[PDB]
Design a protein around this ligand. Structure first.
Ligand SMILES: Nc1nc2c(ncn2[C@@H]2O[C@H](COP(=O)(O)OP(=O)(O)NP(=O)(O)O)[C@@H](O)[C@H]2O)c(=O)[nH]1
Ligand SMILES: Nc1nc2c(ncn2[C@@H]2O[C@H](COP(=O)(O)OP(=O)(O)NP(=O)(O)O)[C@@H](O)[C@H]2O)c(=O)[nH]1
Ligand SMILES: [K+]
Ligand SMILES: [Mg+2]
Ligand SMILES: [Mg+2]
Lengths: 265, 292
């Protein structure tokens, strides 16, 4: 991008960069239009103001004691929960995990291993146990121990699978049954490599269980995570953290200005 | 024939209108390029493809035709079917077979290894699974459990085990048990992680696989071109598996990956279950991308 030169050529370049970042046609067009109609010639900081502003629709404080973690298969839910245990134990919080993926091969054992590495206790059942009943029991356990935070892992599910989205809904009600205030956080995990489907994922999970935040993983890769733009524009859901690796420390609270700088880089 | 909303409008607005201006043609091709990008086709690949369509349509006299909607649509469809492979094609197996499953973190490799084990078991081959991912927690157990489910043995690689040691244990189990299809499940890795890409290339050099399958998630966006190019240049890819096609992602990453590699998309993953494997049909994906 030639930040200085011919407006019409600076905007052609910006369009390309946004499209290559997975911003998508609709959001890219709207950004470009809004900037054109603004009359502004300082295109660099008009575009930057716009993007940083929309991505805000500093330590992250959960609004309650139970965080429910959701998303499609393979996006990084289990690993992110491990990183959230590390993040919050560093802040002197008493953290418990619920291995609520009782469906996939080694889905519970996987989070258990992380629990052992991190000295965080993990509520598990045998494969096939009802994840909603397990979440209920996990919440009761967290209350009884006086713990600060419980992270509820869930099986990966495609947002197109209607009944599996109903299962997620039951999990949420089961949490609320054990503790009426909960869950005060429902965080979608999105893989940064995802294209336009990320918007549909976000829409459908929001519809099902009502998101209070998004975590974008795998932002250490070459992908920019650009579909966050239409997600936040459309759903007004704040971005909480970014995942930048496979270790328990590889989590950063979301920084809109640095994200935007990276997106256009 | 119903297309995506965007293409229905772009093609539909041309219908019954006789010959169209060069500006209406240019307008139509721009909309095709945008549709492809909406479908997660890499922007450069999209530009390249619509240049190929423009030239083909012009050789079919699109600007003299009284039915240019028909000429354009036919050109686009047939070009997309062709660029995706033309017809279904499966691997050709030899007397002995050793394959790698490679790709990004979370794409579907471990599950795909087990699906292939079941598919070929049913065709009277004798598979062996190799759990070669020693970095992801419970990766070995994950494949062991899937092997048990599909009734196929699983060799689990040890922490720190050298490629040469792996090779010896694998060839010996395959000898003792007369296993003719060996499926090596590798850890997910970034295409820019030079140490891990180097590791993978050194496992390939030692093990000598006949096939190296890039497992690509259907929801993958613009980076599919870069990822496929890198796995191909750094390791060598012989074919692709497109996973999670039971979702609603359009699957345009398959066009990016096939464009830059020229390699066949062999299989489609269509559920989370061992049975959720089908041959890939380029005509089917062509329709999915175009919103048939
Ligand atoms: N490079 C990188 N890899 C990540 C990041 N977050 C998660 N991963 C990786 O992505 C893969 C999938 O992670 P996992 O936590 O199993 O995802 P999941 O959403 O729980 N999967 P499932 O739906 O099967 O339960 C793992 O290999 C893991 O190490 C990240 O920020 N960067
Ligand atoms: N719906 C659906 N889910 C799939 C398909 N293929 C794999 N999965 C799912 O996607 C998730 C990731 O699969 P997995 O085999 O762990 O992926 P991986 O590439 O081996 N991950 P890693 O890089 O960490 O080793 C699992 O939850 C699995 O059940 C598919 O075709 N359809
Ligand atoms: K990045
Ligand atoms: Mg998981
Ligand atoms: Mg795996």
């Amino acid at each position: 991008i030639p930040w200085g030169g011919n407006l019409e050529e600076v905007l052609e370049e910006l369009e390309m960069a946004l499209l290559a970042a997975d911003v998508g046609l609709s959001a890219t067009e709207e950004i470009l239009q809004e900037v054109r109609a603004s009359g502004r010639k300082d295109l660099k900081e008009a575009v930057k103001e716009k993007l940083v502003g929309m991505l805000e629709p500093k330590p992250v404080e959960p609004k309650g004691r139970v965080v429910l973690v959701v998303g499609v298969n393979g996006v990084g839910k289990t690993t992110t929960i491990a990183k959230l245990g590390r993040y919050y134990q560093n802040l002197g919080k008493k953290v418990m995990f619920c291995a609520g993926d009782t469906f996939r091969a080694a889905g519970g054992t996987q989070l258990s291993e992380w629990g052992k590495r991190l000295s965080i206790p993990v509520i598990q059942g045998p494969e096939g146990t009802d994840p909603a009943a397990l979440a209920y029991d996990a919440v009761q356990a967290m209350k009884a121990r006086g713990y600060d935070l419980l992270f509820v892992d869930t099986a990966g599910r495609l947002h197109t699978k209607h009944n599996l989205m109903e299962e997620l809904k039951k999990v949420k009600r089961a949490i609320a049954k054990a503790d009426p205030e909960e869950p005060k956080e429902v965080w979608l995990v999105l893989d940064a490599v995802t294209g336009q489907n990320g918007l549909e994922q976000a829409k459908k999970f929001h519809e099902a269980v009502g998101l209070t935040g998004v975590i974008v993983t795998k932002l250490d890769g070459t992908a920019k995570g650009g579909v966050l733009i239409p997600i936040v524009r459309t759903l007004k859901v704040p971005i909480k953290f970014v995942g930048v690796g496979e270790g328990p420390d590889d989590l950063q609270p979301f920084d809109p200005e640095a994200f935007v700088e990276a997106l256009l880089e | 024939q119903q297309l995506s909303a965007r293409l229905q409008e772009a093609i539909g607005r041309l219908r019954g209108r006789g010959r169209i201006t060069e500006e209406d043609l240019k307008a139509t091709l721009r909309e095709i390029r945008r549709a492809l990008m909406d479908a997660d086709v890499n922007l450069e690949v999209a530009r390249d493809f619509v240049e190929r369509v423009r030239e083909e349509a012009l050789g079919k006299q699109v600007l003299e035709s009284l039915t240019p909607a028909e000429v354009i649509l036919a050109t686009v469809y047939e070009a997309l079917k062709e660029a995706l492979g033309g017809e279904a094609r499966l691997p050709v197996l030899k007397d002995r077979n050793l394959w790698f499953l490679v790709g990004l973190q979370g794409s579907g490799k471990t599950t795909t290894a087990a699906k292939l084990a079941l598919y070929y078991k049913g065709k009277g081959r004798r598979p062996l699974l190799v759990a070669a991912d020693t970095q992801r927690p419970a990766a070995r157990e994950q494949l062991r459990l899937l092997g048990e489910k599909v009734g196929v043995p699983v060799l689990e690689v040890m922490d720190g085990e050298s490629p040469e040691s792996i090779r010896r244990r694998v060839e010996e189990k395959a000898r003792l048990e007369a296993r003719d299809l060996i499926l090596v499940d590798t850890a997910g890795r970034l295409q820019i992680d030079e140490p891990l890409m180097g590791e993978l290339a050194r496992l390939k050099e030692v093990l000598g696989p006949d096939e190296v399958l890039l497992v690509l998630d259907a929801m993958t966006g613009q980076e599919a071109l870069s990822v496929a190019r890198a796995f191909d240049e750094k390791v060598g890819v012989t074919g692709l598996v497109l996973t999670k096609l039971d979702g609603d992602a359009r699957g345009g990453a398959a066009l990016s990956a096939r464009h830059v590699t020229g390699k066949p998309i062999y299989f489609a993953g269509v559920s989370e279950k061992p049975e959720g494997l089908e041959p890939f049909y380029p005509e089917r994906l062509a329709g999915r991308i175009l919103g048939m």
